[PDB]
Amino acid sequence: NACHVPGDQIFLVSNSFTRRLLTRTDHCPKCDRLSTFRFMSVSGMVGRMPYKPVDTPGPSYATLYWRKQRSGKIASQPLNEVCNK
Amino acid sequence: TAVPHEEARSRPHFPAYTEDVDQPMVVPDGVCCFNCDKPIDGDDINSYVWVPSGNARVPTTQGYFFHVKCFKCWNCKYRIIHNQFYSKDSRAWCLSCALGRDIRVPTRRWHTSYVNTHRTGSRLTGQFFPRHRHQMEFLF
Amino acid sequence: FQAGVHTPHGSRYNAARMKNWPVQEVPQNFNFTNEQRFKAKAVPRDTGKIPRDFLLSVLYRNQPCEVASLWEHCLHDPQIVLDSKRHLREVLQQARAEGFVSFEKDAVTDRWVCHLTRERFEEVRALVGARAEAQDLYSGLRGASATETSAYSESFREMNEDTKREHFRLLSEQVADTTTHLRKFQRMEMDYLPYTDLNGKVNFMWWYEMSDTR
Amino acid sequence: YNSFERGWKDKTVHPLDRRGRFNLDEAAAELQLDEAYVASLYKPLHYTYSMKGQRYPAEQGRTSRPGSLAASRDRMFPLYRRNYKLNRELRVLDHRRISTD
Amino acid sequence: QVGTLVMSQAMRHALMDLERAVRRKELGLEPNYLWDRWGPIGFIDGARADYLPRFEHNPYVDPDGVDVTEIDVLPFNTHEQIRERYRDFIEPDTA
Amino acid sequence: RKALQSYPVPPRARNYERRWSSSRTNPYNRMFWRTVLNEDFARPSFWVSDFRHKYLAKHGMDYQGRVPASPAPGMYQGFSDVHKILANHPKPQRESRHLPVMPMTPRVVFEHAQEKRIDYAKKMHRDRRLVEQLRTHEFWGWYMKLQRVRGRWCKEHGVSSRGVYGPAVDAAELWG
RNA sequence: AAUUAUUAUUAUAAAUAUUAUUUUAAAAAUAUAAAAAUAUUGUUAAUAAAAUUAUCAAGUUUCAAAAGCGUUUAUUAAAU
Ligand SMILES: [Zn+2]
Ligand SMILES: [Zn+2]
Ligand SMILES: [Zn+2]
Numbered sequence: 001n002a003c004h005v006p007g008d009q010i011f012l013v014s015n016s017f018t019r020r021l022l023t024r025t026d027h028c029p030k031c032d033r034l035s036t037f038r039f040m041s042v043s044g045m046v047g048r049m050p051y052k053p054v055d056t057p058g059p060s061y062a063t064l065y066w067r068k069q070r071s072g073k074i075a076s077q078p079l080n081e082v083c084n085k
Numbered sequence: 086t087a088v089p090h091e092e093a094r095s096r097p098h099f100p101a102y103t104e105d106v107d108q109p110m111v112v113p114d115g116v117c118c119f120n121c122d123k124p125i126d127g128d129d130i131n132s133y134v135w136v137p138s139g140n141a142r143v144p145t146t147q148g149y150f151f152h153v154k155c156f157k158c159w160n161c162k163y164r165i166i167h168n169q170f171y172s173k174d175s176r177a178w179c180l181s182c183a184l185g186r187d188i189r190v191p192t193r194r195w196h197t198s199y200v201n202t203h204r205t206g207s208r209l210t211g212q213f214f215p216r217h218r219h220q221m222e223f224l225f
Numbered sequence: 226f227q228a229g230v231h232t233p234h235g236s237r238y239n240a241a242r243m244k245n246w247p248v249q250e251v252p253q254n255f256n257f258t259n260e261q262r263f264k265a266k267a268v269p270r271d272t273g274k275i276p277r278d279f280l281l282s283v284l285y286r287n288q289p290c291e292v293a294s295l296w297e298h299c300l301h302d303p304q305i306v307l308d309s310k311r312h313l314r315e316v317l318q319q320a321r322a323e324g325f326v327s328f329e330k331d332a333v334t335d336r337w338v339c340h341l342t343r344e345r346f347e348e349v350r351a352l353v354g355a356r357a358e359a360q361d362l363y364s365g366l367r368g369a370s371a372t373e374t375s376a377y378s379e380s381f382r383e384m385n386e387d388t389k390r391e392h393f394r395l396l397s398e399q400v401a402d403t404t405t406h407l408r409k410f411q412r413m414e415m416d417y418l419p420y421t422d423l424n425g426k427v428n429f430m431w432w433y434e435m436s437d438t439r
Numbered sequence: 440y441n442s443f444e445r446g447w448k449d450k451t452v453h454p455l456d457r458r459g460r461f462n463l464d465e466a467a468a469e470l471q472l473d474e475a476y477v478a479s480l481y482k483p484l485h486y487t488y489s490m491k492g493q494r495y496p497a498e499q500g501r502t503s504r505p506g507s508l509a510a511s512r513d514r515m516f517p518l519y520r521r522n523y524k525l526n527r528e529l530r531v532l533d534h535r536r537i538s539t540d
Numbered sequence: 541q542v543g544t545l546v547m548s549q550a551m552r553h554a555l556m557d558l559e560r561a562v563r564r565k566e567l568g569l570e571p572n573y574l575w576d577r578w579g580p581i582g583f584i585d586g587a588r589a590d591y592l593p594r595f596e597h598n599p600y601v602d603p604d605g606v607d608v609t610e611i612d613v614l615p616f617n618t619h620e621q622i623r624e625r626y627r628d629f630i631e632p633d634t635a
Numbered sequence: 636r637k638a639l640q641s642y643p644v645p646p647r648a649r650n651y652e653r654r655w656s657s658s659r660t661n662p663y664n665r666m667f668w669r670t671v672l673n674e675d676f677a678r679p680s681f682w683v684s685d686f687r688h689k690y691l692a693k694h695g696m697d698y699q700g701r702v703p704a705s706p707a708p709g710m711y712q713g714f715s716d717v718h719k720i721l722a723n724h725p726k727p728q729r730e731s732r733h734l735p736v737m738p739m740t741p742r743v744v745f746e747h748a749q750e751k752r753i754d755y756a757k758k759m760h761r762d763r764r765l766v767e768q769l770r771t772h773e774f775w776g777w778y779m780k781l782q783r784v785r786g787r788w789c790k791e792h793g794v795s796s797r798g799v800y801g802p803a804v805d806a807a808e809l810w811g
Numbered sequence: 812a813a814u815u816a817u818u819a820u821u822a823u824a825a826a827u828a829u830u831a832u833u834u835u836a837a838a839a840a841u842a843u844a845a846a847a848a849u850a851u852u853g854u855u856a857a858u859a860a861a862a863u864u865a866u867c868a869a870g871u872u873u874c875a876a877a878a879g880c881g882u883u884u885a886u887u888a889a890a891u
Contacts, residue, residue, distance in 0.1 A: 249803065
């Protein structure tokens with residue numbers, strides 16, 4: 001939902017920061033500096049549309065496949081925790 | 086894409102914002118002009134015309150790279166009309182000259198193509214989000 | 226994080242305590258309803274530099290390390306900046322996406338091994354260098370009688386002749402017992418504060434110092 | 440509008456873009472970009488280069504009135520005077536560059 | 541003026557191609573002077589003739605890293621300091 | 636309507652006609668495939684396609700080689716607006732051996748006036764982001780001074796900035 | 812174009828500026844339609860070529876009558 005010079009992140013955009021939507025400026029963690037991000041794809045909405053369920057627009061078939069890699073197959077590390085504290 | 090058929094976009098012919106979370110699609114560091122061979126600024130700029138020919142790999146880790154001013158036909162030295170070029174032995178040749186034809190001067194702008202910069206003209210095609218089976222979605 | 230709320234009792238993880246958070250006891254009758262177990266929106270953990278600079282110095286020591294017994298190592302460092310098993314795993318997701326660590330199931334076994342990725346491997350080697358360069362300053366023995374540990378210079382060099390792998394074995398549990406005494410008389414208490422960047426993403430700025438209680 | 444009476448005033452001038460105070464020429468010195476040029480980037484291109492543009496009539500400045508002296512368009516708007524060195528140097532083709540004989 | 545030749549833009553691009561041919565054999569490489577493939581029909585190599593008041597968007601590029609620019613040829617103004625600098629190229633061989 | 640012979644270069648977009656056809660853009664990519672694919676489409680451009688008829692006569696053969704481009708010096712000397720009795724090539728030369736020079740027709744000079752106003756545009760953009768990557772680049776660098784000076788002040792004044800409650804509502808890591 | 816009006820005058824070129832003209836406490840019509848169970852043409856001279864949509868905006872089939880694809884001031888077995 002936003003990438004980098006070489007990396008990615010994720011964020012739901014409001015109405016107020018619609019200007020910064022296409023390309024941002026942010027701290028790229030695969031670096032130590034602010035670097036301009038892009039908008040590789042959508043991941044939902046910041047609020048409800050009238051008369052519609054919680055996931056009115058739906059994230060995507062795409063941004064889900066990005067999620068199913070981040071959370072997804074964590075089977076490398078249910079060790080050190082699963083959801084507990 | 087995979088997008089079996091009848092699911093791709095129809096009126097503009099292509100979906101906006103090719104999501105590419107599978108492979109990040111960044112400009113490489115060992116990058117260089119195909120036509121000129123001078124190293125290219127990493128990513129801070131749109132002085133380079135980055136043609137990622139879908140998945141390319143061979144021209145560079147990603148697709149061919151050209152500074153906006155090295156994007157001319159090498160043999161005839163004018164612009165690449167309608168931007169279809171012909172990679173002749175690692176020096177982009179104009180299709181008409183590279184094809185044997187000889188009409189060797191255009192009308193509008195001679196030594197600089199009409200091209201877009203940094204793939205912005207090449208993102209009408211190639212590698213939309215579901216670039217493969219990608220069934221990891223609905224499987225458990 | 227409290228003893229009996231999200232976690233079973235007695236699981237008071239002996240790691241960096243959060244600052245000002247009073248650990249209070251809950252009766253051993255407690256249990257959420259079948260739905261409150263799940264609402265429970267936790268507090269987000271720092272994954273920034275100081276944990277990611279501290280975790281990697283661990284995984285640089287124990288280069289191939291079974292993930293299961295990884296947490297039992299970060300507890301051992303005097304500079305543990307990690308609140309609990311949850312914080313480690315979230316940092317371990319961060320450092321995973323950064324490209325620093327790379328889990329591989331240890332083919333001969335069925336457990337993954339946090340391998341420091343060869344891509345950014347030469348970065349952490351420098352990174353572990355600066356901290357050690359800046360850590361040996363503090364110790365009151367480094368500088369008072371440097372010759373007390375000049376007995377160590379030769380030994381460990383000639384130790385690596387016969388039993389280097391067996392030397393540090395006892396040294397490993399030795400520090401594990403001596404870092405606990407410290408961790409009873411001082412811990413790195415983490416005081417955090419939220420803040421909103423120009424892009425409206427509320428996140429927390431952190432810092433850590435050592436609380437002296439004795 | 441914290442006015443209580445709207446007008447040509449108390450219309451909060453920039454209820455956004457809070458990162459004010461840009462020292463262009465100071466910043467232009469870091470980029471080594473001809474301080475006179477950089478400041479021109481940040482005003483409508485009508486005002487600096489020899490481009491077709493639309494000017495407001497009060498901006499043009501009035502003849503010498505009984506109430507006020509002749510207020511030329513420059514002495515009231517100094518940083519809008521076109522710089523025709525900077526135009527020519529950038530936008531027009533010099534005899535030199537095509538002198539063939 | 542005494543001897544300072546009025547160098548048209550065509551010249552200061554003909555004196556660039558000469559200087560670029562010097563630097564090459566000053567680098568030790570082969571000085572492939574452009575106008576020694578230039579014959580009575582134009583480029584003998586059957587190539588498109590490179591016309592001299594060359595556009596600034598078609599600068600002659602040699603992938604050997606030779607620098608010649610306006611700062612280079614402006615001192616070679618008068619007749620004398622080229623007949624000795626580019627002696628080896630402007631002069632034909634009669635042997 | 637401003638006859639095309641007035642424009643320095645003939646116009647890019649060429650509007651036509653067709654009451655029953657509404658689309659601004661000329662369909663290129665069709666005018667391109669023909670021409671590239673079919674040799675004949677574009678008139679031979681006399682010279683590069685003469686020089687046969689002069690090889691065949693003087694050599695008894697088809698030329699059977701790639702014809703040189705850039706017409707020889709001395710050809711088409713009476714012509715004045717060649718541009719068609721050629722490709723768009725320049726009027727070749729005099730019958731001389733002087734180095735090739737573009738005869739600065741009103742057209743060639745205009746192209747110079749583009750490749751300077753192309754370098755002009757790409758330069759006014761290239762250094763907007765160069766100063767835009769100071770303003771926002773330094774605004775962040777300064778904003779983090781703010782969250783630091785706010786970070787320092789919010790510890791001595793003890794404003795935890797996390798609600799009316801004490802941290803004992805935080806330590807639960809519930810909502811409350 | 813009667814104007815400071817519908818109004819990017821598209822000859823060019825370029826691509827991240829936090830460039831800066833839009834009153835206001837209601838229901839009728841109306842312009843208009845978000846939302847929403849059944850029904851599917853019973854409405855009508857006649858449904859189906861009839862805005863946009865991330866729920867990604869596309870009816871299928873048969874028969875009869877009907878040429879060229881250009882071109883028209885009441886737009887077609889007009890006139891080419
Ligand atoms: Zn990055
Ligand atoms: Zn290039
Ligand atoms: Zn060519």
